């Protein structure tokens, strides 16, 4: 029962990404501590100009969580969870107009562990530019979701696919939208 839900969510695992520390307001990530550059990254420019978060607070929490991980690996007698495959959806940000710029969104949902490989393909060809991605967003059911983005110019000759590899999938999941 709430008007708003503000949550600090952090995870730590054996595979890459080894850890993650983030803050969400109503299921939307406001900021995260980039563990590699060791600095706070704000989702929108406006959040950074108005607020501050000291990176050491995230780094310290990751350290605590890693200690808790090792203790639970011992306690659970090395219990590895089942691989829960993702559910993929491709949709544009804007209504499609041939020739007019747009963003294709690949939303990978209900998966565990947060270990994944995502590639954008156009006509069976690997696409490296105009690509962006969200973090591994923690769901309230202890599963994860993620967003992948591709900035493109709608062409009737160009066929886009989002390919996702996950341990719970024997075959990679290949999803599309024009």
């Amino acid at each position: 029962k709430a008007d708003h839900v503000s949550t600090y969510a952090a995870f730590v695992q054996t595979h890459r990404p080894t850890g993650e520390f983030m803050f969400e307001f109503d299921e939307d990530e406001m900021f995260y501590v980039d563990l590699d550059k060791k600095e706070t990254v704000w989702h929108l420019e406006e959040f950074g100009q108005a607020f501050s978060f000291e990176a050491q607070g995230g780094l310290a929490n990751i350290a605590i969580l890693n200690n808790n991980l090792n203790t639970l690996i011992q306690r659970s007698n090395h219990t590895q969870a089942t691989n829960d495959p993702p559910e993929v959806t491709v949709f544009p940000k804007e209504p499609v107009e041939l020739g007019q710029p747009n963003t294709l969104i690949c939303h990978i949902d209900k998966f565990f562990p947060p270990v994944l490989n995502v590639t954008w393909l156009c006509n069976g060809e690997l696409v490296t530019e105009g690509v962006a991605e969200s973090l591994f967003l923690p769901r309230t059911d202890y599963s994860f979701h993620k967003f992948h983005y591709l900035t493109f110019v709608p062409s009737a000759e160009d066929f886009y696919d989002c390919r996702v590899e996950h341990w719970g999938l024997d075959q990679p999941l290949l999803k599309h939208w024009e």
């Binding site: 299921e27 607020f51 590895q80």
Partner: protein, 197 residues
Amino acid sequence: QAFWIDLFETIGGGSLVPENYLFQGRQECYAFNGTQRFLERYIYNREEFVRFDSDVGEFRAVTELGRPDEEYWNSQKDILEEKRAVPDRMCRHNYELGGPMTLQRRVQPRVNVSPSKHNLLVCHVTDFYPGSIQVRWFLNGQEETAGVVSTNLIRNGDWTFQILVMLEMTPQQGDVYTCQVEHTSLDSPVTVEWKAQ
């Protein structure tokens, strides 16, 4: 200008000595009518085993795995006193701090009316914040309630939403269809028209 954190609790391992194991921690602040409720969740893989709930005032084992953690952490009066202080400390602080850019965040919807690829007329309402939005269809000033399909609210993951509202139409020459969007970011409603021709 600064967001506050509280450190997660330490589950000590003691002193004695593809493959994947995960540990997740969550510090949840539920804001409601001035009130603040705090939950601290300790998750191993997908299993929440122990949690602190401000409405309980102590740690409670969610599963049998968190029984040692309930027993131990509750015997530490210093841990209990700092957790109990969270609703009024960080929950209240961060909520007040992140107010104008979060709860007072208002981004206007962009509206496009276009007929589908039973002839269908599509109202694509895009890039708005918050999620709550009212989309109504009108034909020559009279509201159309039947043959209307509203999709689920679509979260883009970039602090904006999108929604598609479509109507079953039987168009005659000169018919004027109007998609009317009402949102908290708008003073007066937005109206986009489609002429049948």
